[model samples]
Target chain A: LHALLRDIPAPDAEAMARTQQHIDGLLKPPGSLGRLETLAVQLAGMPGLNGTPQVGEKAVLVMCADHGVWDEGVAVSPKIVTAIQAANMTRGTTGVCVLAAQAGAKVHVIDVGIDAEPIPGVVNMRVARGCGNIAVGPAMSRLQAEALLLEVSRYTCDLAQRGVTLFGVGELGMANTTPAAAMVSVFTGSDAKEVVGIGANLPPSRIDNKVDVVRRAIAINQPNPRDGIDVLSKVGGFDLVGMTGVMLGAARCGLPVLLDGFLSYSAALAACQIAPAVRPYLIPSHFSAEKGARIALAHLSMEPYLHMAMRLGEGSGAALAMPIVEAACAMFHNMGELAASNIVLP
Target chain B: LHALLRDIPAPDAEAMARTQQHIDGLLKPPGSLGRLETLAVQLAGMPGLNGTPQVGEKAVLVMCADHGVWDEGVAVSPKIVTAIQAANMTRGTTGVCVLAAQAGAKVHVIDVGIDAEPIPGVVNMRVARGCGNIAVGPAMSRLQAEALLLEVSRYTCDLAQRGVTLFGVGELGMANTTPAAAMVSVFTGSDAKEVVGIGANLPPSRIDNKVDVVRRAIAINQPNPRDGIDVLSKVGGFDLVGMTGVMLGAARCGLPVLLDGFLSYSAALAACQIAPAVRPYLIPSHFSAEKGARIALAHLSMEPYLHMAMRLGEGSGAALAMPIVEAACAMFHNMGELAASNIVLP
Candidate 1:
């Protein structure tokens, strides 16, 4: 994972200046673009450029792995389902892949760890075949989680070096939302019920049981309130660790990171807990109906651009939002009066 | 105007099917993507493809021409600003253009007759330079209004032929919202204050005068409630007519049409009045704080995607919303199904 954050380029100042000037020239009363203009400015600062950030080369890497806590029957879906869905994600026929293709983005499916061996053509970077049963013990050893994070960090850095300007993080692991909700509740000092929801609408009783499971994990992990990474490593899945690495890599590389739905946001929260600077590079794609997501974004002081009441978590939100990012870049590039144009101001 | 409708190609069935199938396979449980899923499915039926309806090639065409109705001081902005802004729009340096370009879309400024010939490069497709000032007399001869409608319809058809898939409708005629608000008020039987807002923020007396202007226009136009085209021709400004054309063209071409702020929604209400099928193709990009927009959309049984308390009239709302649209599409495309893969089904 250390390879993910290896080769990111520094920000470009000259390009940033040009983009800002161009933004100021678009007609209407000055400063009417509102948050959009701010979003553009932030993009400029992150990419270190004033000119348009080249986003066509961007790719969102989704990391998939499994958690063992489901053995407690706390989720609607079985743990084996995580590996299955990860395989489907690699097929390029999934919703995320289709939307990514439509947005002219690439979707990289990574198997950090699952119960199964690598499928053909899927990127395999397994830290472990699967995590230990968290209901009985920690999800993964702290060392294992750290190793996974390093791997993801390195891969993201490599992508940035290859001219990928935007990075989106997605994860696939059944029963993972349980741990995510627990971590979020602990971080926000909110009740478990406030952050928990019907994860796959498990049986009503199962949902209650799931919440209890998360509470139990919280007690067992005894996560340090001051150290998010430590909490995640103690109770989070491999995918969470991998996603945190992606976030770190994007921040270090000065690339914009598009966050999908709940799982990705939880990962981001963990990343932010580790390094506050990562917050600036994060672009929340949508407001997921999931309770955890709402709490997570609020904690980060971020607002999502879209709200279609989505709860699906395969990077669909990020893929859907890519076009807007592209447009922002286009505006930064195409519609501006040259200082020499002498265009009349509004 | 007929040319615009005549030029667009028929919808593609294969693409729609592919998009729908992709959406059904997302990681969430069946029917969980909600409005986002519905939007993607609708887009598929219209654009009929995953990749061809490119935003870069889309355009929001604003047709600017005066409505003589402003003699009542119903609007805060002077009539002259209509033509001035129209000319500015031609320069492609205005707020709408900036935001549109930012969203990777284009702005096509058209002069359907503004009481003056628009500056060079402002495409001259005027049925007349401007309509008769309607404060005292009818806004335009019934014949002239019909001619303008035909012209707008033709323009849309032409753009559709050129592969412009997405469109936004905008207007720039002062005091036009008077007629729009009246239309909305009548259609929904809403209270005058609730359906009226600071269209140019006219003085209270001017607002009363504006309301009277709308009431009189409606009385004179006595538009056939059944024929949207006729109603628009009777009381609509050149910009409104142009937007109507855009909606018709997009629908015929099976492309999605985004309604800008209030003005665009007013025009959309008119189009829907003419052809109910048009409603399916229209996306209320945002709820303009403008009362007319709220009333119009509510009457049409549509919901605006965003509500940032915006009242700007330069299609900025629609442009700002492109990201949300993109996110919806992404969710439709990226989510994977449990049944088809290793993930367990509910």
Candidate 2:
């Protein structure tokens, strides 16, 4: 427990009100642009945001790791997938890379604990080759948790100097859903069945076992609900925690952070529990087909920009949403229509 | 009643199956790409498409008109707003055009009818100043409906020869929701209450009146559900009829048409009633706030790509979905090797 975590930056309400006033006066009717209108207000009022508030550059950081929980047979994919995909991340042919390129956003693949040989382009954090299985014991120690969290927080904060104004955080780890579900259920106080879903197209036979893994992990660890760090230490994966760090760092830098699906959802839940102010800076990319996605979004009071029923990991959903943010940023300038010169419709 | 309308071209099921096979072979699990996967299959299988599939060129056809139904106070905005927004459509300052530009798609503003001075950029094909009040009388004569549908069907089909493969259809007119809900209700055999929503932000008090207007319009028009063109002749606006034309035309050319919100939803419903083959060529963009949208989508078994809570009428939602179709097209080309030199994620 530390006081350092609680002092998150407060949003400038006055600036937000000013931005909302400007939006209200746009040629379109009140809330005519729906979610875009509200998000524009929030982005405009971010702490230290430029006067013209625009998402000039965007990046998606995919933190990779290996889930020891795969030993529980909770996932259909093999642990070697962590290596295969981490290598794929380096190649730029993955789902996230394809979508990010379309949105003009870059994908930074970082390995936190992948059990693979080094891929040339992926950043090597290598906290470990794999995590401890939470189904039977603590996923990691409090000290290990402290070091990893501090590292990721620093990793993301380093990007501000790189001039990235918009950030998307995604994750890659096989059988990682067990911990994500555990983390989310722990924070939301919901039953595992209420939040669990078929991840990675796992067959019907694996459904009950995955659910049991999440429940048993929580019952065995008895994570402290109030302390998000404790929850992450006992039941969260390194990549999930790494994602949480990106949100905090983005909040600290006054930038907008686009959240991907459930992995990032669980991380966001943890990030909010740790520092509540980070919620305003966070935007949801799409509602994942995973059942808990809506609950995670509702818990954060955020609405996703897309709902394509996407369930793939690899920052794919977040990558799809970057263009929406990019376009909404341009909306403010176009709406001034003092051109009121010629505008149309009822 | 014409043999010409019933003989719509068929979807190439074998070609579609081939693209879906490509989708299934992608490294990601089945359905991981969500609605985007199926849309790619549809685009690839379009007749005369290159063996390589992609959405290189995109356009949203916005047909502008005015509704005499506005005299019944069914909408919050006045009839003049149609002209106001239709003019804005030409200037590229409207919500739909703004989004179209961001999606790298063009907005084709065509005037079917608007009670205002003509602008230079808008394609003028003024069928009439405004449609009849559907609450009291038919919107247009059956002959006018035939002529309008034939005209727009020819207009869009000709574009296929001009090299526009992907299409989106959106509409702008006062009190348009009144007829859209009526048309969908007739087709679905559902009550007006099940499908009505306040168009353009009509307040709670006005919502009840809007519902009544829809119910009364259906009762007065008694638009035959058995005949699709009959429904349009009785209860649909010129813009709505024009939108239906685009879908029929696109299906005839074996191209894809992405639908906007409820207005386009209703038009697509009418288009489908006229020719069942058109169903395979249609894709939903976003689920609008309008209540009828769910029923319309369920009837076609189509899912929306975006759900940003957007309800702006000027083709805003359709423009937002173009990139999604574009990305899915790339999914087919990119996902060749199960394990590639460059790909990202598990």
Candidate 3:
């Protein structure tokens, strides 16, 4: 883990400056692309990702797992549905797959923990059958959490070497928001009530129960705010841990990571906690309908460009944002400079 | 115009209900797609656009003109650049063309009015050499404004017949925002201060001058709030009128229209005023850095989905939004149903 952290490089300041100057030289209104220019500049700053890397080579890495917190009835979807959705993704018949197809991106499903029989077509990297109920105790051991991050980071670097320039991190895990809320609460130093949200459309009457589950999880596990491993092991699900690894790996390879929704935000918060240098490599996809999304993104100091209220987990929001990123890259590469466009200011 | 308004069909309530039911049957979380779902439902309700009309077949109709308000120094770029940029779009080298190409959409440039000599590779639909200065008097005769709308509406319907199912409206006219702010002020009952903005990056010192120009134009024109033609004739540029025509025509043909930015918002507001039934067919693309954007959109009772601070206004924002709209369509058509996925909710 220490080696992985050390491998994450700081942003290339000169590259970012060149990108900004290039964008400003375009023959349009100055700063007219707004947050898009900012996003492009961020991407350009990454090591070896300087000048408009082929943003069309996009992939969404979906980390699948199951959380034992479902035993407490904290979510609407059944626990077994995690395996089903992951399988559905493998068939190219899921939300993330359809959206990714539209954006000309590939969806890579990884099974971090399914709590079911081994599924075909999904990348097998199972840590265990499932996580321990965080409401009662730690989700996993500290060593297991470290291994999850390290192995997933290694896998991500491999994906990058395979010509995937842009990476979006997503997850599929039932009752996962219970663990996500706990992690956000610990990372953002907020109360469970402030961080817990209605995951997958829970009833208003059941929100209090979800909040209670998060509070109890944090109280029982006692995760350290300074140590991402302690926090992940105590209150984070394997999918979340895997997503953090994807982010960490993407940063180490100097690629931008597109964050999906609330769960991805929780993973990003954890990733940034582990290595603050990773923050610049992260791009927020949308404003999630999940209640904790605002605080989580706020703590990360990242602002989402899309405000479609999307909350689907399997990188759906990130897939939808790919075109905008590609548009930015195209603008950076194709737009004419003011002098070349020949517009005389009067 | 009245004939076109009468031809505009009301949204198909049955089709919309079917779309909602179809969306709800999917395996993912309920309302998880958020605004994308709402947008899909809107498209479904359009007459011939029911159940996801090939959203991949898209086009951006860029109406190019020259605003006489440019003579007042209300903008940063030279007035002659309107012709240059419009010509640039034809060569696929402008901001809008680059972004539209990324979204798999075609850019169609229309020369509604250009003070310069005719440029090659641009469709000539010139109503006049340029609009009359609104700050001095009327922008154009009411008959000219009506003719602009009528001809552009016919052109749009013809384009739809050519297999462009999705339409995005954009414009290129120097100091266009001056006229846009005036029209928005009249339509929304807003003061000039509430609507005038930094068009193409005006300095703070010049903002007050721009605002004064809008206020003076309104005082001189005294355009009727109830009459869109009067507003367009008195304070609107040819590009704005052409975009309003595009919206009207898209609605008349029962297709969805994506609006680019604040100028497009002004056009949309005018379109909705001319025909209130056209509201459902119009979709806002982004939150503009232009100050009038919020009031103009709010007055039209529409909300922008992408908030990239994109004020480039040559359909760049709309181009970015096309993929998301297509993703919504894909999800509606491709994602498996809850029952088909075969995971019982516990």
Candidate 4:
């Protein structure tokens, strides 16, 4: 893990600089394309994109698991729905599947720790049946957290080798936000109340219960803020750890990764803490409607381009944002310059 | 104009209700898809989409013209670049062209009132060489404004009949925001200081000049707030009027029209004022970084889904938002119901 973290290189400065220049030379007002130009410049700095940025063959790796906190009635969906949704994802009939297919991206549903019988078609990398209720105990052992991270990281590397250039991280887990909010509080030094949100549609009357659960989880786990593995072992779900692995792997391979919603933010924050070099490879897709979303993303000093108030966590936001990246690359390669187009500026 | 405005029908409440119910039955948590669900519901209510909410064969009609306000030194690009960029758009080498192509949409560069000689390949519907300088006098006579509106409205209806399922409104004109800001201020009852922006990368020092120009335009014209035709005649550019015509035409044809940015918002506000029924047909694409954008959209009670801080006005934001609309329809049509998926709520 230490070697892998150390091996992640910084974004290519020359490539980014060249891309910015090329974007500026496009036949439009300079700096007017705003976030799209920024996306193109960032993608150009990634591996094998210096010649021309291409977000070809995108895939969203949705890490599916189950959270023990659902036992506290703090979530909308049942625990078994995690397994059901994972199976549905494999058949291309879930939220992430339809949106990803519409954007010409594939959804890879992986079973990280779903608490059900081995589901067919889902790529099973189950580390445990389900996480321990973080409100009273550590979610998983440090050994299990590290093993899941390494395994998903290797899988991501293989996917990259098979020509998937753009990667998106998402999760499907019942009451996963309990652990995710706990991780955000740990990493950002925020209060549990400040980082806690209605994970997947808890009513306003039950918000206090959710907050209390996260506060108890944080107080009990006492995860080390500086140590991502320790934090993951204590309060992170297998889904978040798996997503963090994808980010680490994407960073190691020098590819860009899209973050979906609040859960994805938790994994991204955790990944950056473990390997600060993963920061540049991370591209936020949307400003999640989750209450804690703003504070969580603030820690990374990054803002998402899409603002649909989406609370869905099945990589739907990330899937919808794929075309924007492609649009950025398309503009970069296809537009002519002001000078070249014989349009003189005053 | 009155005939077309009166002929515009209300959105299909039955289709919207059915789409919303179908969306609620999806396997994901209810309301998890957020604005994507809203988009699907809206598209379903559109004419011809009442069956399946198809947004196939999208086209962005980029109305190109020249703004007489360019003489005030309130914009970054030279006035002649309007004709140049419009010509470039015809060759598929401009900002809107590339982004529209990336989204699988066509860019119809319409020469509504370009100052130069007629360019080949551009749909020449020139109302005049350009409108008069609005900072000093009326933009155009009431006759010209009404004529332009009728012409573009008829053109849009014909395009809709030719199998274009989705329509997007964009504009290309130097210093167009000067007139657009004036229109926004008039319609929204906002002060010039509040409505003006540093349009198209105008330096901070020149923003004051732009604001002063808008103030002068509104003060001199004193456009009737309740009358869209008076507003267009007094302070609007041909591009804004043309976009308004497109919106009115789309509404009359029961089609959805995507609004691009601040300029598009100005046109939308005018269309809504002229034909209150046009509100349901308008779908804003982005929250433009323009200063008055929020205030302008506020009057319409609409918020854009994309928040890329884009200020370019070649239908770029609208084009980028097309895939999101498609993603909404995909999820609506493709996903199975939770009950059918055997995922019970507890």
Clashes of each: 65, 13, 0, 0
Worst 10 residues of 1 chain B by lDDT: B47-56
- Candidate 3 C-alpha error for residue B267, in Å: 0.9
Ranking by DockQ: 4, 3, 2, 1
lDDT of 2 by residue, A1-346 (tens): 2433555567878878888877766767677778788778878878756744587678899999998899998887777878887777777777888888878898899888887777677898878888899999988888887777777777776787787888999989988888999998999999999888888887877788889999999999999989888999899988887898788888877778999999999999998888887888888888888988888778877777777788998899888888788777767767545236443433
lDDT of candidate 2 over B1-346, digit per residue (tens) = 2554666666667877888877776777678888678667777777746543677578899999999889988887766778877777777777888888888888899888887778678998888888888989999998998888888888888888888888999899978988999998999988888988877777778888888888888888788998999999999999999999899888877778889988998998899888888887788888888878899889877878777777877778888888888788777777545644243334
Q: Model 2's lDDT to the true fold?
A: 0.82
Show where candidate 2 strays beyond 4 Å: A1-7, A51-53, A336-346, B1-7, B339-346
Sort candidate 1 into its docking category: acceptable
* Model 4 DockQ class: medium
Provide per-model DockQ scores: 0.33, 0.50, 0.73, 0.77
Give the per-residue lDDT of model 1 (tens digit) for B19-86: 77776666657665667767776677665244322343667777777777676667656567777777
The residue ranges of model 4 lying beyond 4 angstroms of the native Cα positions read A48-51
List, residue by residue over A1-346, the lDDT tens digit for candidate 1: 2333344455556666766776776544344445566667778777533246556476878888877787778777666766666667667766677677767788899988877877766788988877766666677777887777777787887887776888788878777787778778777788888888776666666677777888888888787768876778777788888888898877877778999988887788888777776777888887887867778888988888776777767787787777767666665565544333433432
Every candidate's chain B TM-score: 0.87, 0.93, 0.97, 0.97
lDDT of each: 0.71, 0.82, 0.87, 0.88
Recovered native contacts, candidate 1: 0.41
In candidate 2 chain A, where is summed lDDT lowest over 10 consecutive residues? A337-346
C-alpha root-mean-square deviation, each candidate:
5.4, 2.6, 1.5, 1.4
DockQ of 4: 0.77
Better of 2 and 4 by TM-score: 4
lDDT of each residue in A66-159, candidate 3, tens digit only: 9888999898887788888888998888899999998889999999999999999989999999999998999999889998898999999888
